[PDB]
């Protein structure tokens, strides 16, 4: 029912190798060529990747900023409100970003702000304005 383990023999392949007197030689050469074709394709990409790596030399170390570690506060100071309003204008409903920007207000506190100051800060007008971009 089966070839020995590791031995490969398909109806399709036998036909190909026995189609003519030199069918086998043709099959094997066309494969030798596909191989060279793939190897040069490898060296090519290797060469390109090597150049791209050379551009990332140094990584992003000189561009990193210290972290602004500050505890989360309950009350909203005028400064914070104004930061929020602008944050909403730039980010929209990305509460994480808005929280990060304000620095001392958690995600929930920000979500709440959206409801509590909805009328006073024309949050509806601001959101529709973020949508225009």
């Amino acid at each position: 029912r089966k070839p020995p383990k590791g031995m490969f023999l398909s109806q399709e392949d036998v036909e190909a190798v026995s189609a003519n007197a030199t069918a086998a030689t043709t099959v094997l050469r066309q494969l030798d060529m596909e191989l060279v074709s793939v190897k040069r394709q490898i060296q090519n990409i290797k060469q390109t990747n090597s150049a791209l790596k050379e551009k990332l030399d140094g990584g992003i170390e000189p561009y990193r900023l210290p972290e602004v570690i500050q505890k989360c506060n309950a009350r909203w100071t005028t400064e914070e409100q104004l930061l929020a309003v602008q944050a909403i204008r730039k980010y929209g409903r990305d509460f994480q970003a808005i929280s990060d920007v304000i620095g001392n207000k958690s995600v929930v506190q920000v979500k709440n702000f959206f409801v509590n100051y909805r009328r006073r800060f024309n949050i509806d007008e601001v959101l529709q304005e973020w949508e225009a971009e």
Partner: protein
């Protein structure tokens, strides 16, 4: 297998079942109740046991009946029938044994046997035993035919048959108890030495042999599952199949190499895309930092938009730096996934040049076994007789195989140096025309009731013919003759005055440089009492070497040996003999093989007797007159000594049945 069951097995019979031949002679029994069949089988097995227990004396009906116990010894006709049946078919009382009942003084019928090889000799002994007048015509100046032994001083070496392939079920086992045969086991260890003279490590040897077996198994799959048995209206040969299988394995090695390097590019490409993202992201980060730095220049106190700008740019910068760290994490994964693939390549080749040479040694070995190049063997039937192999270890005849035919010749009427030229067979008898090989003009005429032809297949193929049949043989027979293969293999006997080789090693191989020459002196045998080495020439090399002088052949042998054991160790041989079976006009080859386009059915056709037409218009259908025996006429055991012996036993029984009548069939 022991007891009465052992006897059946030793006679190549199923112990619990009646054969087709037995059905024909005992139709009453095989068509009757199971119980009676069991009685018959026991009588048959037991009769065989008595004979096998002591093959040195004639087993008579009286002797048989006396040694049987109740209730079997009560049906005397059934016992007598079984006995005559076995005797007639050569299953008992064959070979050389002391005769109890003397031979009938006046004989019945005349039979001429062409050839005195084992098949001819075995048939003659039988016919003589049955009471017929028998004469053998032999072309050579000796008996034995393809069983030929070289004898000079103490040197003894077989140029023909040499191996007894297991005693389990082999009729030669009986012969070996009757004749002074000195059987010696053949140790199977066989080191191989490459052309450079250095030995092949255990590891290679085993790996290559396993592959060789795997490739044979593969051709069998190609035959029974893909039905690859006809290519361009031509029957496929074993050779062709192997070439296809090997090419497919080479293809697979390249298919795997391709898929391996394609996984590298795919990954290598994913890396490119990731690096591109990283480079663009680094630009954005570079830019944002600059903007953040500029925003930080507007020093406080500053309005809330200025503060927003600083805080906003800060957040955007951190977010992007987080994206970069994630991509850098992915870069390390892809980079290592590449060092992994680069380190795990698939195989470079299916078989190296060295591996191929060692593999060719195995093919040469198969070419030797079948006495023919692999490109001539039928893919479908080359191994049609594998299921009939005997059990036990292979042996060699230490005192020379010729001891068998020489012994079988005792008491027979043999005309040596008598070459048959023409065989005439008619409705009332035959006439054989032969000449004296020492002076061809001298002619002999032999008239007889029947002719048993044991001419080798090689001779039967001779064109134009060496022996003319009048009337010509029919097409069904001649076509079988044309279709069957008739191989060749040769031996080079090297007689030395000392032992420079390993005495505990029975055989060793020489691995050729090219496929073309794989069979050239590929194997050496160390086998007799004297210091002798026997070299084999197989496959395509057999035919070609026949055109090379002994000196050049021997020179090559010595060169090989010097390369293995050292230049100073190998002396000049004291005596050398080189066989040339193809050129031998009385053989024209070594033995038959199942050629591509042939099948086991051709062996049956070779076996069918010929019946001449009537001499007189309207006269009844004659008796068969021309019979055939020989190695090429026995489907289950062709190309062997036991096969030839069995073929003779068969024809003797058929001839005797035809001309003496059968009293056991009623």
């Amino acid at each position: 297998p022991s007891g009465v069951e052992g006897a059946a097995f030793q006679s190549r019979l199923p112990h619990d079942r009646m054969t087709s031949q037995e059905a024909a002679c005992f139709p009453d029994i095989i068509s009757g109740p199971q119980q009676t069949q069991k009685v018959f089988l026991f009588i048959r097995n037991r009769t065989l046991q008595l004979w096998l227990d002591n093959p040195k004396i004639q087993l008579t009906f009286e002797a048989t009946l006396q040694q049987l116990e109740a209730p079997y010894n009560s049906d005397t006709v059934l016992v007598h029938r079984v006995h005559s049946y076995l005797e007639r078919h050569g299953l008992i009382n064959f070979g050389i044994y002391k005769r109890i009942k003397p031979l009938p003084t006046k004989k019945t019928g005349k039979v001429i046997i062409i050839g005195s090889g084992v098949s001819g000799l075995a048939a003659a002994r039988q016919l003589q035993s049955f009471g017929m007048d028998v004469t053998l015509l032999e072309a050579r100046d000796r008996v034995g035919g393809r069983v030929a032994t070289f004898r000079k001083g103490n040197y003894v070496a077989d140029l023909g048959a040499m191996v007894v392939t297991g005693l389990g079920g082999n009729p030669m086992a009986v012969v070996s108890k009757q004749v002074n045969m000195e059987l010696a086991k053949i140790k199977q260890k066989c080191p191989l030495y490459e052309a450079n003279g250095q030995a092949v490590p255990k590891e290679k040897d085993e790996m290559v042999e396993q592959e060789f077996n795997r490739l044979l198994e593969a051709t069998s799959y190609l035959s029974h599952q893909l039905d690859f048995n006809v290519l361009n209206n031509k029957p496929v040969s074993l050779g062709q199949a192997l070439e296809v299988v090997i090419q497919l394995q080479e293809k697979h090695v390249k298919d795997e190499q391709i898929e391996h390097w394609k996984k590298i590019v795919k990954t290598q490409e994913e890396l490119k895309e990731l690096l591109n993202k990283m480079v663009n992201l680094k630009e954005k980060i570079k830019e944002l930092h600059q903007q953040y730095k500029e925003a930080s220049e507007v020093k406080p106190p500053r309005d809330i938009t200025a503060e927003f700008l600083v805080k906003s740019k800060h957040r955007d910068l951190t977010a992007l730096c987080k994206e970069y760290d994630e991509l850098a994490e992915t870069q390390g994964k892809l980079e290592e996934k590449l060092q992994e693939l680069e380190a795990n390549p698939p195989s470079d080749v299916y078989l190296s040049s060295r591996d191929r040479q060692i593999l060719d040694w195995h093919f040469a070995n198969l070419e030797f076994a079948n006495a023919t190049p692999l490109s001539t063997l039928s893919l479908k039937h080359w191994d049609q007789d594998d299921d009939f192999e005997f059990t036990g270890s292979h042996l060699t005849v230490r005192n020379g195989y010729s001891c068998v035919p020489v012994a079988l010749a005792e008491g027979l009427d043999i005309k040596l140096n008598t070459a048959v030229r023409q065989v005439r067979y008619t409705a009332s008898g035959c006439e054989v025309i032969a000449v004296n090989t020492r002076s061809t003009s001298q002619t002999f005429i032999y008239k007889c009731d029947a002719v048993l032809c044991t001419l080798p297949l090689g001779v039967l193929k001779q064109q134009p013919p060496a022996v003319q049949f009048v009337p010509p043989l029919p097409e069904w027979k001649t076509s079988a003759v044309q279709r069957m293969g008739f191989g060749n293999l040769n031996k080079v006997v090297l007689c030395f005055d000392r032992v420079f080789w390993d005495p505990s090693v029975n055989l060793f191989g020489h691995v050729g440089s090219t496929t073309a020459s794989r069979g050239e002196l590929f194997l050496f045998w160390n086998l007799y009492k004297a210091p002798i080495l026997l070299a084999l020439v197989a496959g395509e090399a057999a035919g070609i070497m026949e055109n090379i002088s002994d000196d050049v052949i021997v020179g090559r042998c010595l060169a090989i040996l010097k390369g293995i054991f050292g230049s100073s160790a190998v002396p000049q041989p004291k005596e050398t003999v080189v066989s040339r079976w193809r050129a031998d006009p009385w053989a024209r080859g070594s033995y038959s093989y199942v050629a591509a386009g042939s099948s086991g059915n051709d062996y049956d056709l070779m076996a069918q007797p010929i019946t001449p037409g009537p001499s007189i218009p309207g006269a009844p259908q004659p008796i068969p007159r021309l019979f055939f025996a020989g190695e090429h006429t026995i489907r289950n055991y062709p190309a062997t000594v036991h096969g030839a012996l069995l073929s003779g036993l068969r024809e003797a029984g058929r001839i005797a049945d035809q001309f003496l009548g059968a009293m056991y069939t009623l």
